[PDB]
From a paper:
Bacterial cellulose is a widespread biofilm component whose secretion in Gram-negative species requires an inner membrane, c-di-GMP-dependent synthase tandem (BcsAB), an outer membrane porin (BcsC), and various accessory subunits that regulate synthase assembly and function as well as the exopolysaccharide’s chemical composition and mechanical properties. A third cytosolic protein, BcsE, has been shown to significantly boost cellulose secretion in vivo and to present a second c-di-GMP binding module in addition to the BcsAPilZ domain. Crystallographic and solution-based data show that BcsE’s predicted GIL domain is a degenerate receiver-GGDEF domain tandem (BcsEREC*-GGDEF*), where the divergent diguanylate cyclase module binds both dimeric c-di-GMP and BcsQ through mutually independent interfaces. In addition, we reveal that a third N-terminal domain (BcsENTD) determines the protein’s homooligomerization and targeting of BcsERQ to the membrane as well as previously unreported interactions with transcription antitermination complex components. Together, the data suggest that BcsE acts on multiple levels to fine-tune bacterial cellulose secretion, from the early stages of secretion system assembly to the maintenance of a membrane-proximal pool of dimeric c-di-GMP for processive synthase activation.
Purified untagged BcsE217−523 crystallized in the presence of c-di-GMP, and its structure was determined to 2.2 Å using single-wavelength anomalous dispersion (SAD) phasing on crystals grown from selenomethionine-derivatized protein. The protein packed in the P41212 space group with two BcsE217−523 molecules per asymmetric unit adopting virtually identical conformations with root mean square deviation (RMSD) of 0.835 Å over all atoms. A single c-di-GMP is found splayed in a symmetrical conformation between the two protomers, and nucleotide recognition involves four residues of each subunit, namely, R415 and D418 from the conserved I site-like motif as well as the side chain of H445 and the peptide carbonyl of S432. Unexpectedly, the construct adopts a dual-domain fold with an apparent N-proximal module connecting via an interstitial helix (α6) to a C-terminal domain, in which the last ∼40 residues (C-terminal tail) remain unresolved in the structure. A search for three-dimensional (3D) structural homologs using the fold recognition server DALI revealed that the N-proximal domain adopts a receiver (REC) domain-like (βα)5 fold, where the central five-stranded parallel β-sheet is flanked by 4 α-helices, while the canonical α1 is mostly unfolded in an extended conformation by a stretch of proline and other small uncharged amino acids. Structural and sequence alignments of BcsEREC* with phosphorylation-competent receiver domains, however, show significant deviation from the amino acid consensus of key functional motifs, indicating that the module is unlikely to function in phosphotransfer-dependent signal transduction.
Author numbering: 222 to 487
Amino acid sequence: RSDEKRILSNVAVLEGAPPLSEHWQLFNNNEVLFNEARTAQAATVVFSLQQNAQIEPLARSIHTLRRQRGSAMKILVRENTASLRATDERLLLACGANMVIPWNAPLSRCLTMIESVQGQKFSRYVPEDITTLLSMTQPLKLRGFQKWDVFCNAVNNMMNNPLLPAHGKGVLVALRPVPGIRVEQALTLCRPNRTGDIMTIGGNRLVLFLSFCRINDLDTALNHIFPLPTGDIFSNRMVWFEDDQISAELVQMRLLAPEQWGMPLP
């Protein structure tokens, strides 16, 4: 029947202690724990975080578990060594973890937090593609059309990522089509070939983000993405190439009603 009371945990979480009840099961590492958690349903899964190199493989495992097992499972990250940055915490929580047990919390407090998550159902939306999430902490790996909010999020995660270079992150360009063309039609002509080049449609504008592109190279970039001259497709264009200008424009973009958000044609 139900595995709601079952606790699957890496050995490191109990800091040397044996299983605390008949419900606890211990695993020598996060790989064997994850493989077991794959067959669980409503169980508590407690991964151990030792070093920063484990963040991405852990993000992938949490993501796989949340998407494939559903909302009943409680997925916890026990930070054993002081390593988790605020950005990587945001990533792990967005991938499907209910809670992170920080390093400075002793074993007794760790045990209190494990009991606190019981009966808690995961109600947050988790994106299907892990690259949508990894774009929070890693350079943009998305390409092509993205829904307005997903586009806004990816560009915003890029401006706020402290590991990225301060300069030349790319160019944000909002293109307005000529009277005879709808944005949905202009979108079918928008075919970027580079990873990091994404676009969206909304409020009668085609909005592109071109990674590592200098402002002087914008026309060159646009000539490669479109098979026809951009002057024949679009009447107007608004460009932002400085971090403050891009961030200021993402604020104005986030004000667009979902009824005004466009989607690609079938």
